[PDB]
Write a protein that binds this DNA or RNA. Structure first.
Ligand SMILES: [Zn+2]
Ligand SMILES: [Zn+2]
Length: 90
DNA sequence: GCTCAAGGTCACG
DNA sequence: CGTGACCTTGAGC
């Protein structure tokens, strides 16, 4: 069996594992753009923000913080960028 | 020689 | 212009 996998970033049903933890497609795409595009962000407020589906739209910075914290590793994103190279961390 | 998930690719709000 | 989400790639079992 497996649990109903959940994007533990924003708290919605994950499509599956993406970057070695359960994460939805939006979080995947963001996490890529941030790293691959070397995009800098800042919190509107204080970068002391809980992250939900709603709150992540507001705070890109806090989204990226949550992502790293829970276990979407920066190094998970290959700069080599080759599809299907599964990265369940071990 | 199938199965899982990196991750493009591009359509919608 | 930022997600949202669905097809393709292509590495592991
Ligand atoms: Zn998510
Ligand atoms: Zn914030």
């Amino acid at each position: 069996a497996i649990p109903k996998r959940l994007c533990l970033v924003c708290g919605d049903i994950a499509s599956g594992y993406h970057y070695g933890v359960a994460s939805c497609e939006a979080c995947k795409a963001f996490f890529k753009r941030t790293i691959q595009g070397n995009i800098e962000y800042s919190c509107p407020a204080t970068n002391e923000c809980e992250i939900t589906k709603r709150r992540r739209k507001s705070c890109q910075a806090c989204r990226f913080m949550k992502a790293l914290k829970v276990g979407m590793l920066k190094e998970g994103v290959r700069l080599d960028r080759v599809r299907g190279g599964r990265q369940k961390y071990k």
